[PDB]
């Protein structure tokens, strides 16, 4: 139960970081298209 709590906390901080990076890349992509149109 302790191992799984440390594991799920490590996974969380990995997912929360990936979601931020995906959102930042998605915003950069969109900004290029919206500037071409």
């Amino acid at each position: 139960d302790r191992l799984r709590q440390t594991e799920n906390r490590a996974t969380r901080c990995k997912v929360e970081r990936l979601q931020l990076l995906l959102q930042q890349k998605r915003l950069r992509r969109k900004a290029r298209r919206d500037a071409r149109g």
């Binding site: 799920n8 490590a10 996974t11 969380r12 990995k14 997912v15 990936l18 979601q19 990076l21 995906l22 959102q23 890349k25 998605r26 992509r29 290029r32 298209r33």
Partner: protein, 341 residues
Amino acid sequence: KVCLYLTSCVNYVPEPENSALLRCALGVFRKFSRFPEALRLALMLNDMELVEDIFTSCKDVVVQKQMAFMLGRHGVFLELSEDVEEYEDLTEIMSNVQLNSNFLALARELDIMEPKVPDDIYKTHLENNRFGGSGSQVDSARMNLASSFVNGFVNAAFGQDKLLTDDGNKWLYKNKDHGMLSAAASLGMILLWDVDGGLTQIDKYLYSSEDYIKSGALLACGIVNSGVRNECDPALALLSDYVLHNSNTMRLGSIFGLGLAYAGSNREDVLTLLLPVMGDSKSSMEVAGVTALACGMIAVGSCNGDVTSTILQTIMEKSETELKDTYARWLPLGLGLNHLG
């Protein structure tokens, strides 16, 4: 004839390239000469697409199928020092990523189709329990998994059934561990190609108290990335930590996301990631089989090291037995898949 392929497919090559300058009707029909001749001609499509630079649009049509329509391949082969004209758009096309896929499918499914699809294909039999007396006789605990797969099957392209898989959620903690695994892939196979939005819908299951639900959420993360090369590598970055997690069943399935999301490319990092289970002489045969089914077709190429690992791991437990076809179910399938095609 075989030797006549080896000259006719290379005799196609200079005709629309040297004489004509159509330079896009050839590359759609020059993947015939990818495999029978050599890998050099298989990459000279990328080479003479690189060295041809007449404006931008017509070559963009050529790389629109090198996107992900037959094989990405050179989808990480262009950038050198921001040298290729419109590099950033060519990479967004060949990666299949978001507005070149999800947007389109969304732009059809909201505007030409019905985005509800609430399992009515398995609810169109409204006239069958009145047929032949009465009903309510089947009490087997196998219809639930099949109905779960059916309703998670037709809800592709942003038909997210939140608070509808609660029967699946209660069946996660009840019975059918195989079915508990196969039900957690529903949300993954419901946001196919939505890499940016799909992770946020799967996240809620990655912290589950059930290994079946958590494994099915890892498989869902793999499924969402299938055929889409995202710059953030969210499949590799989430599945890596689970590949060597325990010796039991949860050991078995944990590789499979890397077996699916990274099967059309060739990178060494996932290969040496998935190699130690394949090369430790572990005697649990189904774990070895599913790892072989991943690792023998991560790269459908000419990787000799994976070939030697597969054959050694086979001759590591198959020899001293006279038993069933499970021995040949997955590992020689992967050894065939190494150079198949």
